C-alpha cells in the first residue's frame, strides 16, 4: 500500500548479472529482452519495492484486476520495465504469524497507474455514517498480511522489486556497461574508438 519509489539516475548498471544469479527466480520483464536492456541507455530508473504473497503474482500484471492491482499499485499497459522477486521465508516469514505487512482491501475507486493511496479514511459502503469508528460497512481498509513458516508457498512472502524505464529529450543518465577489447598494433583492424570508428 505504501510501495517505495526511488529515482535512479547517473550510474551504470549490470542488468544481466541479476539474471545470471539463479536466486531471484521470478524475473518478469516487458518491452525488451534482458540482454538488450543491459546494453541500453535510459534517462531514469524507478524502483518499486514491496512484498506480496505467492498467489498475488497475477495481480502484478497490466490489464489484470485485484486488490493488489486496483487498490495498492496499478500497472499501466504501456509498461517497458522489469519485475523481480524471490522467496524470503528466512527473515520475512516468522514463527507465530508475521502480521507486519498491510494491504488496501477496500477503496472507493480503482487506483490509477503509478498512483499510491495511503489515506486512513474509514471505508464507508453503507447508510450508517462511520465518523471514524469500525462497524457495518465502516472498515479501516488496510488488511494485514499473514505469514507463517507452515503456510503454503502460495501464501509465503515474496519480496518484489519492480523496475521502471522512461525516456524523454533529457539525456540518458543511466546505462549499462560497454565491453572493451585489447588493442592490436601494426595490423589492419576494424576499430570503433568510442563513438568514432574507422579502418
Amino acid at each position: 500500500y505504501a510501495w517505495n519509489r526511488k529515482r535512479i539516475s547517473n550510474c551504470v548498471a549490470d542488468y544481466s548479472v541479476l539474471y545470471n544469479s539463479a536466486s531471484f527466480s521470478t524475473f518478469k520483464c516487458y518491452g525488451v529482452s534482458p540482454t538488450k536492456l543491459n546494453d541500453l541507455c535510459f534517462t531514469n530508473v524507478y524502483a518499486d519495492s514491496f512484498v506480496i504473497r505467492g498467489d498475488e503474482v497475477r495481480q502484478i500484471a497490466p490489464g489484470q484486476t485485484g486488490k493488489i492491482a486496483d487498490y495498492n499499485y496499478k500497472l499501466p499497459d504501456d509498461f517497458t520495465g522489469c519485475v523481480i522477486a524471490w522467496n524470503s521465508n528466512n527473515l520475512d516469514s516468522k514463527v507465530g504469524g508475521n502480521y507486519n505487512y498491510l494491504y488496501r482491501l477496500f477503496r472507493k475507486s480503482n487506483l490509477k497507474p503509478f498512483e499510491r493511496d495511503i489515506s486512513t479514511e474509514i471505508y464507508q459502503a453503507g447508510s450508517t455514517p462511520c465518523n471514524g469508528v469500525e462497524g457495518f460497512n465502516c472498515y479501516f481498509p488496510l488488511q494485514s498480511y499473514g505469514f507463517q513458516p507452515t503456510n503454503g508457498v502460495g501464501y509465503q512472502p515474496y519480496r518484489v522489486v519492480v523496475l521502471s524505464f522512461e525516456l524523454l529529450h533529457a539525456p540518458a543518465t543511466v546505462c549499462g556497461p560497454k565491453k572493451s577489447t585489447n588493442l592490436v598494433k601494426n595490423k589492419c583492424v576494424n576499430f570503433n574508438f568510442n563513438g568514432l570508428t574507422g579502418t
Epitope: 498491510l102 482491501l105 486512513t120 450508517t128 462511520c130 465518523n131 469508528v133 469500525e134 472498515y139 488488511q143
Partner: antibody, heavy 116, light 108 residues
Framework: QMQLVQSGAEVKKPGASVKVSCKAS????????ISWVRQAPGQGLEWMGR???????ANYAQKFQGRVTITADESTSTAYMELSSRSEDTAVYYC????????????????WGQGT | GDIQLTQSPSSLSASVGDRVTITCRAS??????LNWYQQKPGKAPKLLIY???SLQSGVPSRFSGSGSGTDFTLTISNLQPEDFATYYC?????????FGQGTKVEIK
C-alpha cells in the same frame, strides 16, 4: 505475558493532566487496534477511543471528541493519554485490544486489563 | 445518527441452574454485530458471546446467542456462583461505540 501493568490510582485537580500506561509484551504487533474504555465505580463501561498502531491515528466517539488526546508507540508498544478532566471525572481506564479484521466482524477480541 | 443499546431486564435474581433470558435491542436494525460480555466487580471483563452467534473459546456451552433484526437474545442455563456477574451489551455496528447499561445477577 498475558498481562498489562496497572499504574497507581491518582486523584487529580481539575485541569490537570492524567496518564495511563498499557504495555504489550510478546505476541505479534501492528495487527490489533489498541483501545480504551472508561468506567466509574457504580457506572457501566463506556468506550472513548482507539489507536491503530499502523499510523497512530485516533478513533473517537461523540462524548470525548475534542476532549481526550491519545497516542501509541510500537517501540515500547504502549498507549498514552493527555487529558485535563475535572475532579468529578475520576474513573478507571481499561486497556483492550483485538485483531480488527476487515471483511468480517470488527470488535475487540481479548487483552483486558486489571485497572488503570 | 446515534445508536444506543437497550438491555432488558436491567437486573435479575436467578438461582442455581435457571433459565436466564436477556433481550438486547437497539434503536435501528442490527444484523449480527452485537456481543455479550461478562464483568464481575474485581476482575477483568471476559467475553461470553461474540458476533451474537458464536461461542467463546474458554467459555463453556452454558451461554448461547440467538435472535436477529431488532432483538438479540442471550440464553443462559446451568447457573453457578462463578456465573453470577454483570451482563454487558457491546455493539460493533456503527458510531458511537456505546455499550450496555449493565445487568448484574446475584444469588438469592
Amino acid at each position: 505475558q498475558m498481562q498489562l501493568v496497572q499504574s497507581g490510582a491518582e486523584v487529580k485537580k481539575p485541569g490537570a493532566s492524567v496518564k495511563v500506561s498499557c504495555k504489550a509484551s510478546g505476541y505479534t504487533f501492528t495487527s490489533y487496534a489498541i483501545s480504551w474504555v472508561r468506567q466509574a465505580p457504580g457506572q457501566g463501561l463506556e468506550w472513548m477511543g482507539r489507536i491503530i498502531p499502523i499510523l497512530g491515528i485516533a478513533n473517537y466517539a461523540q462524548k470525548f471528541q475534542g476532549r481526550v488526546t491519545i497516542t501509541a508507540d510500537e517501540s515500547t508498544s504502549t498507549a498514552y493519554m493527555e487529558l485535563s478532566s475535572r475532579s468529578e471525572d475520576t474513573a478507571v481506564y481499561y486497556c483492550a485490544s483485538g485483531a480488527f479484521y476487515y471483511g468480517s466482524g470488527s470488535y475487540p477480541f481479548d487483552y483486558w486489563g486489571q485497572g488503570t | 445518527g446515534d445508536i444506543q443499546l437497550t438491555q432488558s431486564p436491567s437486573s435479575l435474581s436467578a438461582s442455581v441452574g435457571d433459565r436466564v433470558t436477556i433481550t438486547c435491542r437497539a434503536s435501528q436494525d442490527i444484523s449480527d454485530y452485537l456481543n455479550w460480555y461478562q464483568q464481575k466487580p474485581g476482575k477483568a471483563p471476559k467475553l461470553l458471546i461474540y458476533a451474537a452467534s458464536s461461542l467463546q473459546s474458554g467459555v463453556p456451552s452454558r451461554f448461547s446467542g440467538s435472535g436477529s433484526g431488532t432483538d438479540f437474545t442471550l440464553t443462559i442455563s446451568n447457573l453457578q456462583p462463578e456465573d453470577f456477574a454483570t451482563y454487558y451489551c457491546q455493539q460493533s455496528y456503527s458510531a458511537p461505540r456505546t455499550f450496555g447499561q449493565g445487568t448484574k445477577v446475584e444469588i438469592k
